Amino acid sequence: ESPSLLTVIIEIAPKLWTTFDEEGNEKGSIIKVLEALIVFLNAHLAFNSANKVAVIAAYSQGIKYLYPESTSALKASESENKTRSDLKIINSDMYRRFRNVDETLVEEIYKLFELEKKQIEQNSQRSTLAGAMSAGLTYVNRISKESVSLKSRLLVLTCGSGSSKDEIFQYIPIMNCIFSATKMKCPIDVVKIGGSKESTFLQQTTDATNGVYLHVESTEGLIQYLATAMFIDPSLRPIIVKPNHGSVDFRTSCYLTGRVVAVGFICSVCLCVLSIIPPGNKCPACDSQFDEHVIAKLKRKPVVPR
Amino acid sequence: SLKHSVTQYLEEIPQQVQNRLYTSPATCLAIYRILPPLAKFFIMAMVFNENEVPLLDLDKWVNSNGKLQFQNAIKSMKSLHLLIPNKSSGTLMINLNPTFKISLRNALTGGEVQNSFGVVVEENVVSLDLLDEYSANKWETILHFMVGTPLAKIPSEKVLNLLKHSKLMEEVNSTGEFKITNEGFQFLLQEINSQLWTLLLQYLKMIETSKMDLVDVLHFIFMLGALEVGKAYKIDALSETQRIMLQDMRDYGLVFQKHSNDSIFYPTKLALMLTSDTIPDGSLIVETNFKIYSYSNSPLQIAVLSLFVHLKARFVNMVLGQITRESIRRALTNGITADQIIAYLETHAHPQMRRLAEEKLEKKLELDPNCKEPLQVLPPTVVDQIRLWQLELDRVITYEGSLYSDFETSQEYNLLSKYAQDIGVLLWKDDKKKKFFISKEGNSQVLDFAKR
Amino acid sequence: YKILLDETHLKELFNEAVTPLPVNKINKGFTLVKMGFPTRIFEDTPTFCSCHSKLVYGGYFCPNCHSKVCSLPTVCPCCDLMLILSTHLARSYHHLMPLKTFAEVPTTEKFRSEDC
Amino acid sequence: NELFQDVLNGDGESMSNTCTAYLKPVLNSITLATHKYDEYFNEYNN
Amino acid sequence: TTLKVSNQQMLQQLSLVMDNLINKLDLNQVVPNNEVSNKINKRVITAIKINAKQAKHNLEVKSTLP
Ligand SMILES: [Zn+2]
Ligand SMILES: [Zn+2]
Ligand SMILES: [Zn+2]
């Protein structure tokens, strides 16, 4: 009926994928997930005539756009599109609507891999995934305002591989993406490949935006996971149930300790979550000097007769 | 309409013909688009897995808010022969059509396509300068032929025989003119993609010869939908049957082959327009005094305006016309009903009557909030005049047939009258007058009832 | 004290009236606030919520006293605990991190890229 | 407990499960409160 | 709170991915072996059953009690 937009956020990190390769019994798992993504994009473009596809990778040294290709294509030596430098990666008897998009994205994949190999000497401690789906929502709104309507949806191809834990800098931008996606009613679908069973922030992202979370552990047969569950278009979202069996608690980590929080305290100025009363009677975040009376009232003992 | 029309056409296709039709990946990809999105989702979920899935899993997949949509999709896919229902272990096991599944997987995974999508020869021009106006000219040729305006270029005899065998476009050669039916202006109601669809379903209803099969026609039209405009394609993949329809729609203008028997055929923009869609021209202005001010410059819009509006003048912007009684009589003698003309006026109304219409609806709701009225974009005076003209066309109505009278016994009259009423051919009856009339179509049935 | 000018400026007054007002420097209400994080209980049996005494299938069990409520963010009507979600404080983080305005580049200087 | 055993012999256990499960969470909450009261009482005793 | 790998094998894994991209990707290799498909389908259907049983039932609702 109404066409949609399939925006996809790919998490490419050499350390994460290679630790998945080492933990797994196979090498070259990203080729498998790449071709699974390609046939997913072909399935999405087969779903409707007018639906569109965006794919964005979040590499170590930043983010780059994979489809649609950057507008520097000028039918020149640096065009890098269509028959210009058309290196034979996929077969030429493909459907041309599929052929153009798949060939362009795999050329951009190889170009990103060349650029990341050229900067293999520097190891980034910062993950660019949160800014990646931030720009994904930005392009979603670009398509929504340019084309009048059209639905939209996000897919997240993330990987933990038991090496990267749940980071602290990935708290605020993820919920900014959650509220933005809730504003444009864009579902957020997340599949996590790796040994780490639970990713709490992404679980809340799927739950709060009417999306689906599915953690996976084997690179084989992932298109069953994708085209079985990740294909719920926004046209039929309310009439299809979700396989998101994992139940998230919508909790948070404490600031000065880091553990998952229970009934506790916050600063009434900087509003960070504290499992216990911080030392020095001052905030660890905004250095707000606290009244001794109120923390005496919170340190006050409950009463029972002798 | 469009999706329902092609679905009902492909319902008429036999199951073995449908299974032979599912061979090419282009046909499977085209019919995949014609499924409902719930049906499309379930089919593509069933595509990649060789194991067969019970119907209870698909039923549990759907929320209770879309149970009716799920049942409608099940009806559509069962009628489309895409499911093999299997009875095993007390369960109605469901299996996808294997040829359809294989061809669709090849269309997705880049498998065997047997050049169903054509081949590019990398010699091509821009569509706007050569292809687009050729397609527009070839479409407007048959349009301006069928509306009846004189032309210097007339189409080929094939489309003439197609229109003659069609329900619309009744023809007479002893008079020297081509009569437009109601179905003709009904064809002019919808937008050109569904016009092309109705044209091609009438074509397939026409072509029953041994010279042409069916699966090749469907393959060719679905790959024409699959082709892209601005790149030529080689004629070698088509069969000689598909080549003679390549010539046939080259005459139509769906495809531009620059010369006959050439090896390069250029798809026109109508080929992509056929699959799915995407102040305007033809936006008209009507007043209380039946005046016509049309923001139109295409000859086809004002040509079809000429059938029911007495045109007085034509600017580079306007076509000065007036809704006279005689123009409406010209419309109604063609079978063109008044409500369809009213709908045409509503769809082609200028946005200024739209803003004044929402203004007067705001006045109506602020004056009488207890009742709501539909948005009359055009004033009801002209609509009432058109309805009065329609009614005065048929002030008396003349139903022809036969009448039985002269019954000496009331029981014979009553039995014949109730027999006529039961078969729904009686128009009047009374035992006092001892007469009852039956229609012309019901004459022979009652005559053989009385003879036996 | 704001006075509107036209129809749209009134909605402007509302949507900058939704913003949190900056507090003065002399205001010292720098306190800690005790509140807990309830968990969404899941049950096919409807149960009496502590706020309304009505049968609600869902609910949020209070971490302090294990009492269910209908909506969040609401106080717990058993132990007076401000039951919340991470989403409710999440909606309020962004005021504490206001984005600096994006400075449009000069047209004379060499642009970084052709696309955004 | 009186209401639990009144529907035990009143409706003959066919409704007693529903009556127990309906009032289960508030019973658990007040049981937790009494447990905390007794725990603090023993804490002051110790 | 409630594996470190070096750049050499990064480079060899990168080269393996790049020449595996260069030579061929058969897109039909994503089709399961009809065995893992059954297990993953069972997982998906069980998750669907659990979510549908929970979300089947969710003004107060009518009760069987008088
Ligand atoms: Zn603070
Ligand atoms: Zn309540
Ligand atoms: Zn409580």
Provide the token pair at D25: 């969470």
> Do E64 and D22 make contact, defined as CB atoms within 8 angstroms?
no
Which ligand minimizes its atom distance to the CA of C51?
2
- Asked if the peptide bond before residue C63 counts as cis, ω within 30 degrees of 0, the response is no
Contact C50, C74 (CB under 8 A): no
Residues whose CB falls within 8 Å of the CB of residue E3, separated by 6 or more in sequence, listed in order = A19, A22, A23, A162, A163
* Total number of residues shown for chain D: 46
Cα C29 to Cα D42: distance, rounded to the nearest angstrom: 37
How distant, in Å, are the alpha carbons of A14, A25, A32, A225, E12 from that of A21?
10, 7, 12, 20, 12
| Spatial separation of the C-alpha atoms in residues C33 and C83, rounded to whole Å | 12
Query: Pick from D18, D26, D33: which is nearest to C50 by CB?
Result: D26
Ranges of H-type helices in A9-128: 14-23, 29-47, 96-118
Query: Does residue C86 contact residue A251 with C-beta atoms inside 8 Å?
Result: yes
Q: How many CB atoms lie within 10 A of CB A139?
A: 17
**Chains adjacent to A (≥3 CB pairs closer than 8 angstroms):** B, C, D, E
Contacts of C62 in chain D (CB under 8 A): 29
Of A204, A265, A271, the CB nearest to C89: A271
Indicate left, alpha or beta for B96 from its phi (over 0: left) and psi (-120 to 50: alpha): beta
What token pair was written down for B111?
């498998």
Chain CA centroid to CA A53, Å: 16
Q: How far is CA B187 from CA A87, B167, C57, in A?
A: 48, 11, 55
Residue A214: beta bridge partners?
A191
Angle of helix A29-47 relative to helix B98-109, nearest 10 degrees, comes to 120
Give start and end residues of each alpha helix (H) in B348-430: 351-367, 380-393, 410-422
Which residues, by Cβ under 5 Å, contact ligand 1, an ion? A 267, 269-270, 283, 285-286, 288
Cis upstream peptide for A234 (omega within 30°): no
Q: Which amino acid is at B98?
A: P
* Residue B323 to residue B315: CA distance in whole angstroms: 18
Q: Which of C41, C44, C52, C53 to mutate to test the interface with E (most CBs of E within 10 A)?
A: C44
Chain A contacts of E46, Cβ < 8 Å?
245
Half-sphere exposure of A156 (CA within 13 A, CB side): 35
Q: With H, G, I as helix, E, B as strand and everything else as coil, classify residue B3.
A: helix
Q: To the nearest 10°, report the CA torsion of A123, A126, A127, A131.
A: -130
Q: Of the ligands numbered here, which is closest to the C-alpha atom of C65?
A: 3
- Residue B327: CB atoms within 10 Å: 21
CA of C47 to the centre of ligand 2 (A): 10
Question: What is the residue whose two structure tokens read 């009048």?
Answer: A148
The position carrying tokens 């009904």 is B186
In angstroms, the CA A65 to CA A139 distance is 11
CA dist list (Å): B331 to B146, B288, B294: 14, 20, 19
Whether chain B has a CB inside 8 Å of the CB on E30: the answer is yes
Chain C closest-CA separation from residue D25 CA (Å): 7
Angstrom resolution of this structure: 6.6
Beta bridge partners of B266: B256
Residue (of B270, B280, B266, B339) closest to B308 by Cα position = B339
Residue count of chain E, please give it: 66
The CA-based dihedral angle spanning residues A159, A162, A163, A169, taken in that order and rounded to the nearest 10 degrees = 60
Size of interface B-E (CB pairs under 8 A): 37
For A10, the enclosing helix (H) or strand (E) is strand A5-10
As a whole number of angstroms, the distance between CA B10 and CA B217 comes to 13
Residue type, A86: D
Residue B312 and residue B299: Cα distance in Å, rounded? 16
Rounded distance between C-alpha atoms, residue A172 and residue A192, angstroms: 20
- CA–centroid distance, C55 to ligand 2, in Å, is 8
- How, if at all, do strands C47-48 and A5-10 pair? unpaired
Residue B223 distance to chain A (closest CA, Å): 10
Phi first, then psi: give them for residue B211, nearest 5 degrees. Answer: -65, -30
Provide the shortest C-alpha distance from residue E61 to chain A (in Å): 22
Give φ, ψ of B255 to 5 degrees: -130, 145
Q: Coil, helix or strand for B263? A: coil
Report how far residue A96's alpha carbon sits from residue A86's, in angstroms, rounded to the nearest whole number: 14
Residue E64's nearest CA partner among A268, D19, B256, A76 is D19
For residues A236 and B38, the answer to whether their CB atoms sit within 8 Å is: yes
| H or E segment to which residue B439 belongs | strand B435-439
Decide: helix, strand or coil at residue C76.
Answer: strand
- Distance (Å, rounded) from C-alpha B286 to C-alpha B191? 22
Residue A194 DSSP class: S
Asked if B23 and B103 touch (Cβ cutoff 8 Å), the reply is: yes
Q: Name B177's bridge partners.
A: B172
The answer to whether D27 contacts chain C (CB < 8 Å) is no
- List the Cα angle A170/A175/A178 in 5-degree steps: 130
Can you spell out the DSSP letters for B53-91?
Answer: EEHHHHHHHB-GGGHHHHHHHHHHHHHTT-EEEEEETTE
Q: Which of B50, B64, B109 is nearest residue E30 as measured by Cβ atoms?
A: B109
Structure tokens at A212: 């689906």
Nearest Cα to Cα of residue A108 among A47, A63, A65:
A65
Q: How many CA atoms lie within 13 A of C57 on its CB side?
A: 12
B and C adjacent (3 or more CB pairs under 8 angstroms): no
Amino acid, single-letter form, for residue B6:
V
- Percentage helix, strand, coil for chain E under 3-state DSSP, each rounded to 5: 60, 0, 40
What tokens were used for A22? 């080492």
* Opening angle at CA A117, ends A112 and A121, nearest 5: 135
Strands in A208-274 per DSSP E: 213-216, 264-267, 273-274
Calculate the dihedral angle through the C-alpha atoms of A167, A172, A176, A182, rounding to the nearest 10 degrees: 70
**Domains identified in chain A and CATH numbers:** 4-230 (3.40.50.410)
Which of E:15-44 have CB within 8 Å of A? 16-18, 20-22, 25-27, 29-33, 36-37, 40-41, 44
Q: Is B222 exposed, middle or buried (0-12, 13-18, 19+ CB in 10 A)?
A: buried
* Cα gap A237→B336, rounded to integer Å: 44
Question: Which residues make Cβ contacts (< 8 Å) with residue B96, sequence separation at least 6?
Answer: B43, B46, B47, B52, B82, B83, B84
Which value, to the nearest 10 degrees, does the dihedral of the CA atoms of residues B355, B357, B358, B361 take? 160
Question: Which residues have C-beta within 8 Å of that of residue E60, sequence separation ≥ 6?
Answer: C46, C52, C54, C55, C56
Run of H or E residues at A170: none
Q: Are strands B91-96 and B53-54 parallel, antiparallel or unpaired?
A: antiparallel
CB atoms within 10 A of CB C87: 17
End-to-end CA separation in angstroms for chain B: 46
Q: In the block, which residue shows the tokens 């009032």?
A: D23
Q: List CB contacts of B145: < 8 A, sequence separation 6 or more.
A: B151, B154, B155, B178
SS3 A9: strand
Q: State how far Cα B137 lies from the chain centre.
A: 22
Packing angle of the helix pair A200-208, A172-183 (nearest 10 deg) = 10
